[PDB]
Design a protein around this nucleic acid. Structure first.
Ligand SMILES: [Mg+2]
Ligand SMILES: [Mg+2]
Ligand SMILES: [Mg+2]
Ligand SMILES: [Mg+2]
Ligand SMILES: [Mg+2]
Ligand SMILES: [Mg+2]
Ligand SMILES: [Mg+2]
Ligand SMILES: [Mg+2]
Ligand SMILES: [Mg+2]
Ligand SMILES: [Mg+2]
Ligand SMILES: [Mg+2]
Ligand SMILES: [Mg+2]
Ligand SMILES: [Mg+2]
Ligand SMILES: [Mg+2]
Ligand SMILES: [Mg+2]
Ligand SMILES: [Mg+2]
Ligand SMILES: [Mg+2]
Ligand SMILES: [Mg+2]
Ligand SMILES: [Mg+2]
Ligand SMILES: [Mg+2]
Ligand SMILES: [Mg+2]
Ligand SMILES: [Mg+2]
Ligand SMILES: [Mg+2]
Ligand SMILES: [Mg+2]
Ligand SMILES: [Mg+2]
Ligand SMILES: [Mg+2]
Ligand SMILES: [Mg+2]
Ligand SMILES: [Mg+2]
Ligand SMILES: [Mg+2]
Ligand SMILES: [Mg+2]
Ligand SMILES: [Mg+2]
Ligand SMILES: [Mg+2]
Ligand SMILES: [Mg+2]
Ligand SMILES: [Mg+2]
Ligand SMILES: [Mg+2]
Ligand SMILES: [Mg+2]
Ligand SMILES: [Mg+2]
Ligand SMILES: [Mg+2]
Ligand SMILES: [Mg+2]
Lengths: 88, 52, 118, 50
RNA sequence: UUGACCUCGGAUCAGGUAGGAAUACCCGCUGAACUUAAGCAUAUCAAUAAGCGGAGGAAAAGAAACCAACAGGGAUUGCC
RNA sequence: UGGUGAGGCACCUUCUGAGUCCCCUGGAACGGGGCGCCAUAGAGGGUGAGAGCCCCGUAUAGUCGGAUGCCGAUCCAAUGUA
RNA sequence: GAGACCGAUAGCGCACAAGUAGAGUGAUCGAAAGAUGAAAAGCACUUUGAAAAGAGGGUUAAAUAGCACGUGAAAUUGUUGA
RNA sequence: CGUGAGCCCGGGUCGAACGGCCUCUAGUGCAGAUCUUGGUGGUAGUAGCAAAUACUUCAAUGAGAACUUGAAGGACCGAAGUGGGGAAAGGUUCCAUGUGAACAGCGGUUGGACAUGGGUUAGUCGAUCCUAAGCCAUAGGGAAGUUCCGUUUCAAAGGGGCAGUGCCCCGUGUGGCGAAAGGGAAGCCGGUUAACAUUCCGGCACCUGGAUGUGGGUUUUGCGCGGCAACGCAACUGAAC
RNA sequence: AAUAAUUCUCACGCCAGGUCGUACUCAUAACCGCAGCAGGUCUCCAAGGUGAACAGCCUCUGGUUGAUAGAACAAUGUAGA
RNA sequence: AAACUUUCAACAACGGAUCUCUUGGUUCUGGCAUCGAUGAAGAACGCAGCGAAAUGCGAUAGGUAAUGUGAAUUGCAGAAUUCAGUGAAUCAUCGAAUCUUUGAACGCACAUUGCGCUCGCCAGUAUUCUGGCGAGCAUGCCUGUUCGAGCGUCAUUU
């Protein structure tokens, strides 16, 4: 009775949602994420899974701030206004 | 409820005796504002709100 | 326009009447949202953003004037760059040199010379 | 359940607004390839995974 | 009694700094077995993969307690 | 020891050649035939089919400009503590 | 910026709302899917049908291009003919 | 045409590129690998669609009715139910209106399907508060390190009063998480919607916290009387420990 | 306190009570089993008769009449004899 | 003889091969060095006239300011006063800003939109209670400041 009968007793929800990665991988009893390892400061990732790093790497999100860094450098980190703009 | 009650006073000048709030399944918030018995809510909705 | 406000007109205002403009603009957008449930709302939304930006611009410009001759400025007014650049040694500290080294530079520096001319 | 744990109730609100068909006027946009909502979810088909 | 000195503390005291990301290349630590030996244990794979710590546009090394044995070369790095 | 800087680099930015000539096929010539032009430009792409001359660009400089900081070619200033 | 490279079962897993849809408690695993036409000009109107549609009729160079859309092989199938 | 791999031509479809010759080059030739991916057969209109007793008549709707609806009859669950509620889990499946295709392994006018709208109201219910088994910080000690142990230790650990500082008093000892079934302050009746109700409406209450007035009680040798007693009465001061 | 104080553990009077959940199923169709699967999944309320009895059998309140159907009645079956 | 079975052709099916293409990949070469407690990478939730996704953005939300260009966007009305415009656009540039909840994540926690403390302002008879708004409260380490502790210790008074 390890098959169809035993799957009916399965309503316990071992893993819950994680605050850091948003995956349903936060172990409820250990309070440790199985994906990003979040009781801790350092995000979890290993070199034996190239796909796992690829899914989590820097180019996979919005890049709310790094997308502007490239443009700031190309102009040499300017400050001020373009030589007589309207309004102070 | 404290913010909602004070907002109605400053916005439409509405005096309420109690407010019951909801969070609808779509994610927004509903607020049933019970007006004081000395004012006509139907009259207010016509002029201040335009809900006529 | 009808709901649009031109940036040039607001630049000539002051903080007091810009706030009065802001409050009056917000009131209309509230009434127009009610009427919507029962295109100018887009004009009002941008007008509110336009007024808020200019009010903030006047605040920070005046603040920068106040902290002109102050050693410590708020982190909002401090120039933002890469933090690595902020940790960098200053020009005065980078250009500072030992006293003995300067004595070997004032006398015996690199000379402008040439060969095969005698 | 009826005990919702507001964070969870916030995800359920997101899931039902996302479960809509595509507006008709998108299918006419001079270079459109969108034809039907390929991310449609039904409670009898796929689990939200909360 | 007061005033020093030494050591050890408090403070939402004044001003600062560190962590995380990234790690293709770089500096270290730690560290296998598959495999080859027609078996296998030293050996080999390999002072490699995985794991951990730390930087930069390069890093590291670097101005001889060097090489030589010559009529002597003369910091480091890289190619033949 | 201070000074004064040509320009010559490094930055971007505007501008710079020549057919839509005639006939046939074709839904449409960017095809075929004839007559021409530009080329320091016949790289590339688009335009209703294989387009140097229809359009963007392409080849040489030199001009419409302006931001900053690097270097020197002429010239003029001085002075000795220690 | 290029190529004696690959050309939609190839080339990266991804030429497309691709690390997406989906699977797993989880660590993780992970696809398929490009092409009407120059231009939607994407079939007005009449008639049969409850309707989907059909038959006329019309657009186009072409519907032997009708959105199940460039060409349309074979396996397999229907009608006609031998 | 050639012994052959193949080459060439005619006819039909099609709409934008392609070929011969000499050299150079390679991801260069398929019948198989229980080969890979995609597609398609015979079997085959075949096996089958047979547990949970069971349906029938009339009428309406509709193009169409065994499985839509109303009425009538016949039955079953037979209160450890095929009933009325919930915990976990699910997430809009709830309600109204409408419907071509697909789904409901027969049909479908019907639907947990599809399309558009609507729907969940709390001082009193629960979470929130407490601690349990247990988990994690702090002081410290290991470990090359990711980190491991430690939960009161070999720690100068905290908590309040008076007028942003001053002055006092105590200290044995000084954190957090962990139960929608444990502990726990307090709400009942009637009515109401297509869909909510101890939550809305009407009436009638209760608890906690904070302010603060009147009445009453006590007191002119300052903090109540009665009963033998068990105890009673509307009050009837009470700091640290 | 003797000229007014005082217990605001007596009565009445005054003000306020924030945040989140709340629909629906809870199963022979809303959960898990690839599914509208004879499986599995915690609990409360529990009528009448017979009968020792939440045994079996019949009925009330409440709920269903849902499981592809029609016609024949060969062999061989499955279940009841 | 028909039916059925088998073979071929035409047409019609099923299927998506072949041909041609290509805003994609791959490899090589050249140049550059720029994340973050002044809050990064990532995550969640929201924002459009009519949007589900993608892209973009953050309550100033398919975006504002500034500069340049110079008459659009486009699936429909909506901008026609924006036509000298003192200026359209899902434009380009980008030096000023905004930047919800989180996250190294920093008051303590978080399976909770939970529980706190300090200051200031406003309202309720209020220094103590309640509500609104704003600014704050992590750890380690460094320099200094100030307040201390120790018969560790010096001198004097005593
Ligand atoms: Mg169990
Ligand atoms: Mg509520
Ligand atoms: Mg061996
Ligand atoms: Mg061997
Ligand atoms: Mg062996
Ligand atoms: Mg390694
Ligand atoms: Mg170095
Ligand atoms: Mg054709
Ligand atoms: Mg065609
Ligand atoms: Mg075709
Ligand atoms: Mg065939
Ligand atoms: Mg063509
Ligand atoms: Mg090959
Ligand atoms: Mg082949
Ligand atoms: Mg083959
Ligand atoms: Mg085979
Ligand atoms: Mg049969
Ligand atoms: Mg059977
Ligand atoms: Mg019972
Ligand atoms: Mg029940
Ligand atoms: Mg229903
Ligand atoms: Mg069916
Ligand atoms: Mg049917
Ligand atoms: Mg520990
Ligand atoms: Mg607790
Ligand atoms: Mg409890
Ligand atoms: Mg109900
Ligand atoms: Mg009431
Ligand atoms: Mg008495
Ligand atoms: Mg409810
Ligand atoms: Mg309910
Ligand atoms: Mg329910
Ligand atoms: Mg039930
Ligand atoms: Mg299921
Ligand atoms: Mg499963
Ligand atoms: Mg009896
Ligand atoms: Mg019985
Ligand atoms: Mg059956
Ligand atoms: Mg033969």
């Amino acid at each position: 009775t390890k098959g169809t009968s035993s799957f009916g007793k399965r309503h316990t929800k071992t893993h819950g949602l994680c605050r850091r990665c948003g995956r349903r991988s936060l172990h409820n009893q250990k309070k440790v994420c199985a994906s990003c390892g979040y009781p801790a400061a350092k995000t979890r990732k290993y070199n034996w899974s190239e796909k796992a790093k690829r899914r989590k790497t820097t180019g996979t999100g919005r890049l709310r701030y790094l997308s502007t860094v490239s443009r700031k450098f190309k102009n040499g980190f300017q400050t001020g206004v373009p030589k007589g703009s309207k309004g102070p | 409820k404290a913010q909602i009650k004070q907002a109605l006073k400053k916005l439409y000048d509405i005096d309420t005796v109690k407010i019951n709030t909801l969070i609808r399944p779509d994610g927004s918030k509903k607020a049933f504002a019970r007006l004081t018995a000395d004012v006509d809510a139907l009259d207010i909705a016509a002029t201040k709100l335009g809900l006529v | 326009s009808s709901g649009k406000v031109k940036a040039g007109a607001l630049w000539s205002k002051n903080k007091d009447e810009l706030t009065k403009q802001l409050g009056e603009l917000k009131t209309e957008l509230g009434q127009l949202r009610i009427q919507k449930i029962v295109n100018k709302i887009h004009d009002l939304r941008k007008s509110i953003a336009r007024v808020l930006t200019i009010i903030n611009a006047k605040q920070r410009a005046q603040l920068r004037l106040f902290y002109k001759n102050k050693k410590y400025l708020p982190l909002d007014l401090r120039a933002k760059q890469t933090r690595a650049i902020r940790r960098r040694l200053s020009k005065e500290d980078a250009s500072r040199v030992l006293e003995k080294t300067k004595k070997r530079t004032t006398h015996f520096p690199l000379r402008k010379f040439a060969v095969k001319a005698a | 359940p009826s005990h919702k744990t507001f964070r969870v109730k916030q995800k359920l609100a997101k899931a039902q607004k996302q479960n809509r068909p595509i507006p008709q006027w998108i299918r006419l946009r001079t270079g459109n390839t969108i034809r039907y909502n390929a991310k449609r979810r039904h409670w009898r088909k796929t689990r939200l995974g909360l």
